[PDB]
Structures are given as C-alpha cells and as structure tokens.
Amino acid sequence: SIDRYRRITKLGEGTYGEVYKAIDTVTNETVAIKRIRLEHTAIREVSLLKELQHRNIIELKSVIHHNHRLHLIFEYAENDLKKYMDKNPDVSMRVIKSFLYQLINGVNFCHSRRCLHRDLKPQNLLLSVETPVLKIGDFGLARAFEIITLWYRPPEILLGSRHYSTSVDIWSIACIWAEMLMKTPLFPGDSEIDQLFKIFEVLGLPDDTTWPGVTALPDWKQSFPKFRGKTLKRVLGALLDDEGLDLLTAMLEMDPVKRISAKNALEHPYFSHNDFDP
Ligand SMILES: Nc1ncnc2c1ncn2[C@@H]1O[C@H](COP(=O)(O)O)[C@@H](O)[C@H]1O
C-alpha cells in the first residue's frame, strides 16, 4: 500500500519512470519511490531483489503493485558519485580507493546470488552519510523489465553478443574507477562503433587469440583498423600505483571470460594494505 508514504516529492525522471523522495510514516525514515513504467513473473522477479541486503546495495524495501501501477520503494541516499566528483575535485586517493572497494564488494555480493546489474554508471552509485558509504542502486532492474550509457558498456555487448555475464559489471567498474582518477570518462564514445574505437585505441584490436570467438560476433568488422593500443599505463599509469594498474588491467580484459571476478578483485593485493575504508 502506497498510503504509508507522505510528503512525496518528485526528484526527477529516472530510467524506468518518475523518481520521488518520501517519508515512511511507519518508520519515520526517508525513502525513494520509483514508478516503474511497463507495457510490452515480473512482480516475482523484482520481489526476489528484496533478498539483496548488503551495506553497499540500495535496499529494495517494498514492491507495490496497485491499480495496475508498479512502484518500488528503495532506501534513500542523499548524494551520488557523479555529483560528488563534480563537487569534490580535490577528493583524496583514499576516498577513491574506498569507493572502489565498496563498489566491488556490493557487486560481488550480488554476483554471488546470481544477480547482474548490466547498467552500472556513476549516476546509480549513491552515497549515504567520515566517508560516505557507497550504495549501488538498481541491481537487477535492467533485466527484470543518451550517449552516457555507452561509456560503461563492455565490448562484447557493443559487438552484439546476446550473453550478458557477471563480466559486464566488472568492465563497468573499471570504467568508473578510471573516471574517478582521471575526472573524465575513460572511453567517451558517441556511438557503439565510436565506443569500440575508443576502447580499441587504448587496449588494441582483439583477435581470435586474445579473445577466442571475437571475429564471429555479430557486429565484428574484418575492416576494423589494426589498433595497437596506447596501453592503460600510458593513459593513467601516472594516477595509480603498480598494484592498482595490474587490477585495472585485469578488469579491462576485452574477452569477458578472462576478466577478473569481483571476488578475485577483492582478494587482489591492491586491497591488502589498510589504506582505505571498507
Ligand atoms: N535511492 C535513491 N535515493 C535518493 N535519490 C535517488 C535514488 N535513486 C535515484 N535518485 C535520484 O532520482 C533522480 C533520477 O535518478 P536516476 O535513475 O539516477 O536518473 C536523480 O535525481 C537521482 O539523484
């Protein structure tokens, strides 16, 4: 029942429909309500997301399906990463590494329950009140139901693969991480092919050794330029220690099956030094 929620105040339009903040008069807490525009099992699917209870995941508190309208009630977070990086240019390396750890930790929690995000970006990395706590929003919604979307999309998707795996989210994490360090997007494409080009420009053009099966993907072009790769070292090696570089490189393997897992990323030596807040 939506009648529980008062002072419902529109915040803007999201991916799925209108987004609001509200007061939950049963708990006194502020919540976010997301109107999910449909028309084209869904309630079951979305309801399973309620089990994703983790400090680095925006909690799905309630699914309300009434008068043939669908609202999701979520935990409220006052800030998000894009806004936060805009407002905080001098933010420390320690905050950046904490945000990264926290993102990977959330992601690993979800992947371990067979839940993929598929559309990670700084805009759904919400921040809640020394360091804010990073909480990922909208896990599982891309499934269950603007050029910026492209910037965090992995090459297997851009090349037209039908198989989304956990590796998709790992790619996106690496892109977000690079952006936090560089203050501009790593691969700021303006089309799916321009996007691939931006990726190939840094990482090199794949072949059937570096990425077995790549040339059979639907949108592969035998005419792609034979990019050698600027290399990540050259692009951002100045901003990152050697350990950080090795992690980032592992997350940006172009073949999704070679891309590091969230779990192995959390085990990487980069996070063994107590120089961040989990
Ligand atoms: N859980 C949340 N808590 C607070 N604000 C949110 C939440 N999710 C999305 N928003 C805000 O709602 C608007 C649309 O969200 P987005 O889906 O990022 O386009 C933006 O103003 C976001 O800042």
Side-chain angles (χ1 to χ4, degrees), residues 171-192:
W171 186 271
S172 301
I173 294 175
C175 290
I176 297 161
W177 180 17
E179 194 163 334
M180 293 194 282
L181 299 166
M182 302 168 46
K183 314 304 174 188
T184 192
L186 174 55
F187 301 125
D190 66 9
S191 72
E192 300 186 285

PDB file of all heavy atoms in Angstrom, residues 171-192:
ATOM      1  N   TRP A 171      33.770  -4.821 -16.161  1.00  0.00           N
ATOM      2  CA  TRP A 171      34.124  -3.792 -17.127  1.00  0.00           C
ATOM      3  C   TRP A 171      33.650  -2.428 -16.649  1.00  0.00           C
ATOM      4  O   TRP A 171      34.383  -1.505 -16.628  1.00  0.00           O
ATOM      5  CB  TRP A 171      33.491  -4.090 -18.477  1.00  0.00           C
ATOM      6  CG  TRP A 171      33.952  -3.117 -19.526  1.00  0.00           C
ATOM      7  CD1 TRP A 171      33.377  -1.924 -19.823  1.00  0.00           C
ATOM      8  CD2 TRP A 171      35.101  -3.248 -20.391  1.00  0.00           C
ATOM      9  NE1 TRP A 171      34.085  -1.306 -20.835  1.00  0.00           N
ATOM     10  CE2 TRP A 171      35.162  -2.089 -21.176  1.00  0.00           C
ATOM     11  CE3 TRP A 171      36.101  -4.220 -20.559  1.00  0.00           C
ATOM     12  CZ2 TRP A 171      36.142  -1.895 -22.121  1.00  0.00           C
ATOM     13  CZ3 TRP A 171      37.083  -4.025 -21.506  1.00  0.00           C
ATOM     14  CH2 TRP A 171      37.094  -2.869 -22.293  1.00  0.00           C
ATOM     15  N   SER A 172      32.379  -2.323 -16.286  1.00  0.00           N
ATOM     16  CA  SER A 172      31.802  -1.042 -15.884  1.00  0.00           C
ATOM     17  C   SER A 172      32.494  -0.456 -14.679  1.00  0.00           C
ATOM     18  O   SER A 172      32.849   0.724 -14.702  1.00  0.00           O
ATOM     19  CB  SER A 172      30.297  -1.185 -15.658  1.00  0.00           C
ATOM     20  OG  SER A 172      29.625  -1.652 -16.839  1.00  0.00           O
ATOM     21  N   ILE A 173      32.777  -1.305 -13.687  1.00  0.00           N
ATOM     22  CA  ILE A 173      33.562  -0.897 -12.512  1.00  0.00           C
ATOM     23  C   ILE A 173      34.884  -0.290 -12.896  1.00  0.00           C
ATOM     24  O   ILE A 173      35.239   0.765 -12.418  1.00  0.00           O
ATOM     25  CB  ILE A 173      33.860  -2.091 -11.533  1.00  0.00           C
ATOM     26  CG1 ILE A 173      32.548  -2.587 -10.917  1.00  0.00           C
ATOM     27  CG2 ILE A 173      34.872  -1.594 -10.445  1.00  0.00           C
ATOM     28  CD1 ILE A 173      32.670  -3.842 -10.014  1.00  0.00           C
ATOM     29  N   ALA A 174      35.627  -0.958 -13.782  1.00  0.00           N
ATOM     30  CA  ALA A 174      36.920  -0.424 -14.236  1.00  0.00           C
ATOM     31  C   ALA A 174      36.783   0.965 -14.870  1.00  0.00           C
ATOM     32  O   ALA A 174      37.607   1.868 -14.649  1.00  0.00           O
ATOM     33  CB  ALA A 174      37.522  -1.348 -15.212  1.00  0.00           C
ATOM     34  N   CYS A 175      35.753   1.118 -15.715  1.00  0.00           N
ATOM     35  CA  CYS A 175      35.476   2.412 -16.340  1.00  0.00           C
ATOM     36  C   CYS A 175      35.164   3.507 -15.303  1.00  0.00           C
ATOM     37  O   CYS A 175      35.665   4.617 -15.395  1.00  0.00           O
ATOM     38  CB  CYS A 175      34.320   2.273 -17.339  1.00  0.00           C
ATOM     39  SG  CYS A 175      34.788   1.315 -18.807  1.00  0.00           S
ATOM     40  N   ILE A 176      34.368   3.170 -14.314  1.00  0.00           N
ATOM     41  CA  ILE A 176      34.029   4.129 -13.241  1.00  0.00           C
ATOM     42  C   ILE A 176      35.261   4.530 -12.427  1.00  0.00           C
ATOM     43  O   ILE A 176      35.479   5.748 -12.079  1.00  0.00           O
ATOM     44  CB  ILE A 176      32.907   3.554 -12.341  1.00  0.00           C
ATOM     45  CG1 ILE A 176      31.603   3.363 -13.175  1.00  0.00           C
ATOM     46  CG2 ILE A 176      32.658   4.420 -11.174  1.00  0.00           C
ATOM     47  CD1 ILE A 176      30.580   2.391 -12.538  1.00  0.00           C
ATOM     48  N   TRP A 177      36.087   3.528 -12.165  1.00  0.00           N
ATOM     49  CA  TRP A 177      37.328   3.705 -11.410  1.00  0.00           C
ATOM     50  C   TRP A 177      38.276   4.634 -12.153  1.00  0.00           C
ATOM     51  O   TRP A 177      38.720   5.625 -11.593  1.00  0.00           O
ATOM     52  CB  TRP A 177      37.958   2.343 -11.124  1.00  0.00           C
ATOM     53  CG  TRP A 177      39.241   2.372 -10.363  1.00  0.00           C
ATOM     54  CD1 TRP A 177      39.755   3.402  -9.633  1.00  0.00           C
ATOM     55  CD2 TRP A 177      40.178   1.294 -10.261  1.00  0.00           C
ATOM     56  NE1 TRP A 177      40.968   3.036  -9.089  1.00  0.00           N
ATOM     57  CE2 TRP A 177      41.250   1.747  -9.455  1.00  0.00           C
ATOM     58  CE3 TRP A 177      40.231   0.012 -10.788  1.00  0.00           C
ATOM     59  CZ2 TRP A 177      42.335   0.935  -9.134  1.00  0.00           C
ATOM     60  CZ3 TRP A 177      41.307  -0.804 -10.449  1.00  0.00           C
ATOM     61  CH2 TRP A 177      42.345  -0.331  -9.633  1.00  0.00           C
ATOM     62  N   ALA A 178      38.517   4.360 -13.419  1.00  0.00           N
ATOM     63  CA  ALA A 178      39.295   5.242 -14.288  1.00  0.00           C
ATOM     64  C   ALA A 178      38.779   6.699 -14.305  1.00  0.00           C
ATOM     65  O   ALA A 178      39.546   7.642 -14.252  1.00  0.00           O
ATOM     66  CB  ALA A 178      39.365   4.659 -15.718  1.00  0.00           C
ATOM     67  N   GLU A 179      37.478   6.862 -14.395  1.00  0.00           N
ATOM     68  CA  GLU A 179      36.843   8.193 -14.363  1.00  0.00           C
ATOM     69  C   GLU A 179      37.097   8.915 -13.022  1.00  0.00           C
ATOM     70  O   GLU A 179      37.363  10.140 -12.974  1.00  0.00           O
ATOM     71  CB  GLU A 179      35.337   8.038 -14.594  1.00  0.00           C
ATOM     72  CG  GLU A 179      34.600   9.352 -14.928  1.00  0.00           C
ATOM     73  CD  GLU A 179      33.237   9.108 -15.539  1.00  0.00           C
ATOM     74  OE1 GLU A 179      33.004   8.046 -16.155  1.00  0.00           O
ATOM     75  OE2 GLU A 179      32.361   9.975 -15.370  1.00  0.00           O
ATOM     76  N   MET A 180      36.992   8.189 -11.922  1.00  0.00           N
ATOM     77  CA  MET A 180      37.279   8.811 -10.618  1.00  0.00           C
ATOM     78  C   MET A 180      38.695   9.368 -10.581  1.00  0.00           C
ATOM     79  O   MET A 180      38.918  10.422  -9.997  1.00  0.00           O
ATOM     80  CB  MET A 180      37.065   7.843  -9.452  1.00  0.00           C
ATOM     81  CG  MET A 180      35.636   7.408  -9.200  1.00  0.00           C
ATOM     82  SD  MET A 180      35.489   6.603  -7.549  1.00  0.00           S
ATOM     83  CE  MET A 180      36.129   5.008  -7.820  1.00  0.00           C
ATOM     84  N   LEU A 181      39.640   8.660 -11.181  1.00  0.00           N
ATOM     85  CA  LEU A 181      41.032   9.054 -11.176  1.00  0.00           C
ATOM     86  C   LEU A 181      41.263  10.139 -12.215  1.00  0.00           C
ATOM     87  O   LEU A 181      41.874  11.149 -11.931  1.00  0.00           O
ATOM     88  CB  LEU A 181      41.921   7.843 -11.479  1.00  0.00           C
ATOM     89  CG  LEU A 181      41.900   6.646 -10.547  1.00  0.00           C
ATOM     90  CD1 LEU A 181      42.574   5.446 -11.217  1.00  0.00           C
ATOM     91  CD2 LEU A 181      42.572   6.958  -9.191  1.00  0.00           C
ATOM     92  N   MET A 182      40.729   9.968 -13.414  1.00  0.00           N
ATOM     93  CA  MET A 182      41.014  10.940 -14.464  1.00  0.00           C
ATOM     94  C   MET A 182      40.097  12.142 -14.479  1.00  0.00           C
ATOM     95  O   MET A 182      40.416  13.111 -15.142  1.00  0.00           O
ATOM     96  CB  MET A 182      40.966  10.242 -15.846  1.00  0.00           C
ATOM     97  CG  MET A 182      41.934   9.052 -15.997  1.00  0.00           C
ATOM     98  SD  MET A 182      41.558   8.065 -17.506  1.00  0.00           S
ATOM     99  CE  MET A 182      41.356   9.337 -18.773  1.00  0.00           C
ATOM    100  N   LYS A 183      38.950  12.075 -13.800  1.00  0.00           N
ATOM    101  CA  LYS A 183      37.950  13.152 -13.821  1.00  0.00           C
ATOM    102  C   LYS A 183      37.238  13.373 -15.175  1.00  0.00           C
ATOM    103  O   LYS A 183      36.502  14.359 -15.343  1.00  0.00           O
ATOM    104  CB  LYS A 183      38.551  14.512 -13.331  1.00  0.00           C
ATOM    105  CG  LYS A 183      39.389  14.429 -12.071  1.00  0.00           C
ATOM    106  CD  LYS A 183      38.649  13.804 -10.903  1.00  0.00           C
ATOM    107  CE  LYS A 183      39.605  13.626  -9.714  1.00  0.00           C
ATOM    108  NZ  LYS A 183      38.975  12.855  -8.616  1.00  0.00           N
ATOM    109  N   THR A 184      37.477  12.471 -16.131  1.00  0.00           N
ATOM    110  CA  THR A 184      36.799  12.462 -17.411  1.00  0.00           C
ATOM    111  C   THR A 184      36.585  10.979 -17.722  1.00  0.00           C
ATOM    112  O   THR A 184      37.277  10.129 -17.169  1.00  0.00           O
ATOM    113  CB  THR A 184      37.640  13.194 -18.501  1.00  0.00           C
ATOM    114  OG1 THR A 184      36.842  13.423 -19.667  1.00  0.00           O
ATOM    115  CG2 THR A 184      38.858  12.393 -18.920  1.00  0.00           C
ATOM    116  N   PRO A 185      35.628  10.649 -18.598  1.00  0.00           N
ATOM    117  CA  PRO A 185      35.432   9.221 -18.867  1.00  0.00           C
ATOM    118  C   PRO A 185      36.583   8.596 -19.604  1.00  0.00           C
ATOM    119  O   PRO A 185      37.174   9.226 -20.460  1.00  0.00           O
ATOM    120  CB  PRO A 185      34.190   9.204 -19.753  1.00  0.00           C
ATOM    121  CG  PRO A 185      33.520  10.441 -19.483  1.00  0.00           C
ATOM    122  CD  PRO A 185      34.558  11.452 -19.197  1.00  0.00           C
ATOM    123  N   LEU A 186      36.877   7.330 -19.315  1.00  0.00           N
ATOM    124  CA  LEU A 186      37.965   6.642 -19.974  1.00  0.00           C
ATOM    125  C   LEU A 186      37.699   6.444 -21.503  1.00  0.00           C
ATOM    126  O   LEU A 186      38.589   6.567 -22.327  1.00  0.00           O
ATOM    127  CB  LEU A 186      38.186   5.282 -19.273  1.00  0.00           C
ATOM    128  CG  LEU A 186      39.181   4.273 -19.840  1.00  0.00           C
ATOM    129  CD1 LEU A 186      40.480   4.916 -19.986  1.00  0.00           C
ATOM    130  CD2 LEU A 186      39.311   3.010 -18.919  1.00  0.00           C
ATOM    131  N   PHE A 187      36.460   6.130 -21.858  1.00  0.00           N
ATOM    132  CA  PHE A 187      36.092   5.753 -23.212  1.00  0.00           C
ATOM    133  C   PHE A 187      34.801   6.513 -23.564  1.00  0.00           C
ATOM    134  O   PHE A 187      33.741   5.981 -23.502  1.00  0.00           O
ATOM    135  CB  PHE A 187      35.828   4.255 -23.306  1.00  0.00           C
ATOM    136  CG  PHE A 187      36.958   3.376 -22.932  1.00  0.00           C
ATOM    137  CD1 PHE A 187      36.774   2.377 -21.916  1.00  0.00           C
ATOM    138  CD2 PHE A 187      38.138   3.378 -23.651  1.00  0.00           C
ATOM    139  CE1 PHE A 187      37.797   1.491 -21.601  1.00  0.00           C
ATOM    140  CE2 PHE A 187      39.176   2.524 -23.332  1.00  0.00           C
ATOM    141  CZ  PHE A 187      39.019   1.538 -22.343  1.00  0.00           C
ATOM    142  N   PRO A 188      34.907   7.804 -23.913  1.00  0.00           N
ATOM    143  CA  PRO A 188      33.736   8.634 -24.065  1.00  0.00           C
ATOM    144  C   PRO A 188      33.241   8.609 -25.490  1.00  0.00           C
ATOM    145  O   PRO A 188      33.379   9.599 -26.204  1.00  0.00           O
ATOM    146  CB  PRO A 188      34.257  10.031 -23.695  1.00  0.00           C
ATOM    147  CG  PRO A 188      35.599  10.021 -23.993  1.00  0.00           C
ATOM    148  CD  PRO A 188      36.117   8.595 -24.029  1.00  0.00           C
ATOM    149  N   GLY A 189      32.681   7.482 -25.889  1.00  0.00           N
ATOM    150  CA  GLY A 189      32.157   7.289 -27.222  1.00  0.00           C
ATOM    151  C   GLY A 189      30.827   8.001 -27.429  1.00  0.00           C
ATOM    152  O   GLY A 189      30.069   8.266 -26.489  1.00  0.00           O
ATOM    153  N   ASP A 190      30.541   8.285 -28.699  1.00  0.00           N
ATOM    154  CA  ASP A 190      29.330   8.959 -29.091  1.00  0.00           C
ATOM    155  C   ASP A 190      28.455   8.051 -30.002  1.00  0.00           C
ATOM    156  O   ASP A 190      27.473   8.521 -30.556  1.00  0.00           O
ATOM    157  CB  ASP A 190      29.703  10.321 -29.731  1.00  0.00           C
ATOM    158  CG  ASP A 190      30.477  10.200 -31.075  1.00  0.00           C
ATOM    159  OD1 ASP A 190      30.625   9.098 -31.656  1.00  0.00           O
ATOM    160  OD2 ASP A 190      30.918  11.252 -31.589  1.00  0.00           O
ATOM    161  N   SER A 191      28.825   6.768 -30.128  1.00  0.00           N
ATOM    162  CA  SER A 191      28.096   5.755 -30.905  1.00  0.00           C
ATOM    163  C   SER A 191      28.652   4.368 -30.537  1.00  0.00           C
ATOM    164  O   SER A 191      29.693   4.300 -29.960  1.00  0.00           O
ATOM    165  CB  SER A 191      28.262   5.996 -32.428  1.00  0.00           C
ATOM    166  OG  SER A 191      29.580   5.692 -32.925  1.00  0.00           O
ATOM    167  N   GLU A 192      27.967   3.271 -30.856  1.00  0.00           N
ATOM    168  CA  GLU A 192      28.504   1.955 -30.488  1.00  0.00           C
ATOM    169  C   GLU A 192      29.838   1.694 -31.193  1.00  0.00           C
ATOM    170  O   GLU A 192      30.780   1.231 -30.575  1.00  0.00           O
ATOM    171  CB  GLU A 192      27.503   0.852 -30.773  1.00  0.00           C
ATOM    172  CG  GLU A 192      26.195   1.031 -29.999  1.00  0.00           C
ATOM    173  CD  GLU A 192      25.291  -0.148 -30.196  1.00  0.00           C
ATOM    174  OE1 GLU A 192      24.705  -0.248 -31.284  1.00  0.00           O
ATOM    175  OE2 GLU A 192      25.179  -0.996 -29.288  1.00  0.00           O
TER     176      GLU A 192
END
